[PDB]
DNA sequence: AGTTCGTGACATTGTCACGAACTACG
DNA sequence: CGTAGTTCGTGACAATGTCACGAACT
């Protein structure tokens, strides 16, 4: 097949929702779709993703829909967070 | 495209390719394969758009093809490499 | 053994072989057949003859498997070509 | 696995030996071109046969010698052998 | 729709492998 | 005439890139 992507070259989309639902604590779909830049529809059936293999909880709490971490969803982003820290090392 | 898959969960193929393409200088389209662990043919077919935009270039030895990331090449890396430093680093 | 026919008539194809290589110094199958003539399936046997004795070696080019003259073996061939350069001259 | 021809063919021992002798029977050349008399005879068929030597038979006494173009080949050829030694 | 992993089916050279024809030499 | 040692074509295999697919992401 084709490449052509000049948004997600090195980092996955994928990627940022994580990073965002660390220091954010919690979130939704729509604000996580333009602090972290990310279309949003191209964040919701990704979002799913992490639902399915438990990665993100759901909380209406109230009216809404929240996202979250949960603790395998939070014991692998620190596991990958510093297998990506690594490839780092090396060039400086 | 699809970038995100279940084992590209953070980062891409194009990403440890030009990784490992800097510990080594150059390493060929089947060697990253064994090194980086991703699947051959994906490791190819990034690897020609590497080239037709310039990243790479097939450098011929003998019979056998190796691959560099040229001065082009590199900006991308240094560049790309800094802004999963803005994110990988606030935590 | 199937030592002369046709066109084999002075010099075996182990003659070219260790000569090619003190030309040159190393290479393939390919190269050698390619330049002595000698059809691949004769320049891959006498080369086993050659490593399974001791006069040449196998030398990889990460997939390149080059082959060298060692010691013995050209310390030979300079020790045999006079047996060849002296049934020579009494044609001169 | 080979023993005393590992560059020059048996055949051409005897090639050279009708040189400078001109005329030669296959104990003859066995005995000093230093060959088992079964090789000696054999090769000397095939030159024969591609027309390089001929028998000379004086009695029960059978003499090989180098035909022309049996001489011819040698020289054009021993000039190849040449051009190998000389590249060093 | 456009994109893009990554298996599977091709069209290549480089080296070992079985088999045919013949030479070396008792 | 017979066993041994050989020259080679054809065949079986392992290792690159292309070609074309199916499948899931953007």
Redesign the pocket.
């Known amino acids: ?5 000049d ?2 070259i090195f980092l ?3 990627a940022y929702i994580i990073v965002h639902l660390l220091k954010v604590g919690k979130a939704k779909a729509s604000e996580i779709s333009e602090n972290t830049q990310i ?1 949003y529809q ?1 964040v919701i ?2 979002i799913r ?1 992490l639902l399915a293999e438990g990665y993100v909880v759901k909380e209406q709490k109230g009216e809404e829909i929240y996202y979250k971490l949960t603790d395998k969803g939070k014991q692998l982003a620190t596991a990958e967070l510093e297998k990506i820290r690594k490839l780092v090392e090396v060039v400086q």
Chains 1, 3 share one sequence.
């Open positions: 097949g084709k490449i052509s992507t948004k997600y996955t989309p994928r279309p191209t059936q990704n993703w």
